[PDB]
Structure formats: C-alpha cells, structure tokens
C-alpha cells in the first residue's frame, strides 16, 4: 500500500524498530471491534511478519508477529488465506516447541483460527504435522496455554464433510481423556466438544473413545454445574450409544440412565431434546436395554415431554417411546408398562402436528401397541382389544385415520391397515 518507515522500519535491520513497528500493527489488529485487516494486508507486511516467526528471531518479536498474524487469520476466509499463502502455518507449528510459553499461546491461537476456517485448512494444518507439537503443549502447566490448545484441538476434530484424518486426530484421545478431569471450565467445554466430534462416526471411532476410559467421566460431567459442559458431554454420550449394543451397554454400566433422567428436566431446551435423543438411541437397543430404561424410571418424564414440550423435543421423546414399543413383541410387559404410563394419547395427539417422518414413527409405535393387544386377547381368549379401546377412548382413532388424507403414499397404508385390522 502506502506505509514508509513503518514498513521500511519493519524491513529495517534494527531489531528494536522492527519490534516497535510490529507492536503497532498488533495493536491495530487487536480488534476492539471490526479491525482494518484488509489495509494491513494490502500494505504488504504479511510476508515480513512471517519472517519474524523464524526459529532464532527475538522472542518478543516472534510473539508480537504471531499475535498480529493471529488476528489477520481470525478475519474472513480470504484474509485467512493470505496468512496461509505466506507459508505461516509451518512456522506456527515450529513455535509450538521452540518458542517460550508466551510465544506458544500466540502460535496455537493462530492455528486455531486457520483450522477453524474450513475443512481444507483444517486438513492442511494436520498435513503439516501439527498434531505432535500440539499434543506436546499439554505437557505444560500454564492454564491459559492448555485452554487455547484445547480449543485449537477441538477445531482440528470438528467437521464431517469431509471428516479429518482419523489416523491423526485419534492420537489426541489419550490427551482428551485427561483434559476432561480439568478444573478449568473452558478447558472442559472444548475438550468435551472435541470428544463429541471424534465419537461421531463408525463403531471403530466409538470404540476408540471407549477404550481410553472416557465414557465414565462423560457421565459424571452430565451433572456438571455448567450447561456449557453438560451439552457437549451429552452430545458425546449420545454419539457413543449410536454404536452397537455392547458399546451402548458400556454407557449404561457407567450410570448414564439416572443422569439422563435429571437432564430431562434441564432449563436448556436443547439439553432436554438431546437427552431424549440419547435415550431413544438406548431404547433402540435390545430387550434388556429397553428394560433398563424402564427400570430407571425414564418413561414417565418422557411421556410428559411427549405432550407438553416443544416439538423439537417432543419428536425425540416420540422416537424413544416408539423404539421401546417395538420391544414389546419379545416382552409384552414393556407395552403394558408403556400403556399404563399413559403414552397412547400423547402419541395420537402428535399425529396432527408432526412431520411426515415423525407421524410414521408414531404410527409404528401405535401399531406395536395394537399388535400386542391382539396377541394377548387371542392367547387369553378375549373378544375386545383394550389397547384398541384405549386409542379410541383417547380420541386418537380418528387422528389415526386423519393421516390418510396426507399425500405421502406411505403414511397411507399403515394408517388404514391399522383401521382395517383393529377398527
């Protein structure tokens, strides 16, 4: 752009006026708000700032330069691109083990901004072998360094399309297993988010989270004083129970069911929602796991949410109950319990406000309840299905056949099959 003698003194060989200029740029880029990154970029000072991060540059020069480049990288994607194109990332990484503690926090912050920009830059940071120096930071004690490193670590684990290199990010699991025992709240939060990202994938990824003894602590963190800790911990727990029955049983054995019960009455609506989603994944298991959910007294608050909670939460409670109802074939007492807890009317009432998908989910639940009813009255020699009466007395029999008006060709068959078979 324009600057002399602030760019020239930046290009000076005098180490003092090199620092004085860099500090000026840093103070400018440290946005109270809204900071003039573009005019700093077009001033052509970025490549020089990158030079100041070289191995044997003065410490305070490395610090101020990395700080300045950090804020430039915190801007738009195009502004972050400028830092990347200046080959600054490999120097950020080198400072993670060469620089002092203060310099390390600057560098790891910058890498967080770069990795948080896109999946491309996230992968690029990983391709530059950043993981090993980053994991080395957690050998340090300074809380502020640990806090920032954990944040950057979560940024490297985040993203699904595409997901990061598993062979790389999975190396952070033993470190994350320790980080969730931290006394620092913000460190806890980001560590739990990082785990939720890693636990989101195939059974191999889930098993890796299990093998480092993480689930036990996650369940304990569900009762943390802060909802900022509970939410990512719940997300991670919810991800693990998306695996097979064995992996789901581990979470149950860690005492997740009583914890989930308390979360059903959480002030945060989305915590309620994902608690129901988690339970629904567990009720989605085998007979004994559905029974465990029942024995943990989870159904009554679920039924209560199925009728009075917001739709996004209500639809998740539907999944939980609808799943559990499927189990009623192998154990009819499951259906008997569900019906006795008054689930039929909230299910039926949901049919007239739900999505095309949730209605289909609800219809399967009601069908499982009905199918159990006929199986029982046939084996006991009765003339009337009381579950069919319960539905009719709840006024849902009509709602069942107010769903064939619906133009989806398969909300259509079950709806009238129910009416044709039971009514």
């Amino acid at each position: 752009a324009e600057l002399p003698q602030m760019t020239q003194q930046l290009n000076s060989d005098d180490m003092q006026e090199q620092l004085s200029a860099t500090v000026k740029f840093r103070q400018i880029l440290s946005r109270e708000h809204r900071p003039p990154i573009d005019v700093v970029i077009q001033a052509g000072v970025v490549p020089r700032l990158v030079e100041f991060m070289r191995e044997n540059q003065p410490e305070m020069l490395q610090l101020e330069a990395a700080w300045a480049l950090t804020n430039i990288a915190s801007g738009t994607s195009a502004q972050t691109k400028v830092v990347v194109d200046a080959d600054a990332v490999p120097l950020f990484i080198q400072l993670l083990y060469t620089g002092s503690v203060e310099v390390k926090e600057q560098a790891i912050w910058a890498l967080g901004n770069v990795a948080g920009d896109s999946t491309d830059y996230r992968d690029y940071v990983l391709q530059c072998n950043a993981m090993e120096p980053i994991l080395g930071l957690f050998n340090s004690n300074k809380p502020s360094l640990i806090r920032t490193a954990t944040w950057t670590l979560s940024n490297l684990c985040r993203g699904k399309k595409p997901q990061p290199d598993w062979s790389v990010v999975s190396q952070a699991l033993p470190t994350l297993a320790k980080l969730i025992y931290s006394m620092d709240t913000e460190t806890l939060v980001d560590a739990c988010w990082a785990i939720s990202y890693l636990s989101d994938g195939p059974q191999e990824a889930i098993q890796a989270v299990i093998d480092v003894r993480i689930p036990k602590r996650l369940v304990e963190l569900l009762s943390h004083e802060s909802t900022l800790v509970q939410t990512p911990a719940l997300r991670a727990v919810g991800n693990i129970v998306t695996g097979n029955d064995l992996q789901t049983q581990v979470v149950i054995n860690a005492g997740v069911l009583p914890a989930l019960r308390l979360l059903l009455s959480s002030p945060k609506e989305n915590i309620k929602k994902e608690a129901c989603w988690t339970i629904s994944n567990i009720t989605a298991g085998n007979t004994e796991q559905i029974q465990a959910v029942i024995d943990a007294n989870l159904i009554p608050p679920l039924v209560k949410l199925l009728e009075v909670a917001e739709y996004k939460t209500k639809k998740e409670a539907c999944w939980a109950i609808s799943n559990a109802s499927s189990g009623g074939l192998q154990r009819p007492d499951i259906i008997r319990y569900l019906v006795s807890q008054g689930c039929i009317k909230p299910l039926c009432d949901l049919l007239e406000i739900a999505d095309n998908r949730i209605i289909e989910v609800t219809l399967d639940a009601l069908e499982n309840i009905l199918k159990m009813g006929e199986a029982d009255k046939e084996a006991r020699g009765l003339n009337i299905n009381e579950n069919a009466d319960f539905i009719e007395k709840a006024g849902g029999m009509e709602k069942i056949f107010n769903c064939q008006q619906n133009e989806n060709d398969k909300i259509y068959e079950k709806a009238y099959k129910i009416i044709e078979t039971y009514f």
Binding site: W277, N281, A284, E316
Partner: peptide, 18 residues
C-alpha cells in the same frame, strides 16, 4: 428396535485482544 440415529433429527474463529 429400529435405529440408530447418528444425529438428532464451539466457536470457529477467535480474536486475541488479551
């Protein structure tokens, strides 16, 4: 039962103001 659902139906960039 019938499932599982991987999904139910943090802060990308930060500035250093010290």
């Amino acid at each position: 039962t019938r499932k599982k659902r991987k999904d139910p139906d943090s802060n990308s960039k930060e500035n250093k103001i010290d």
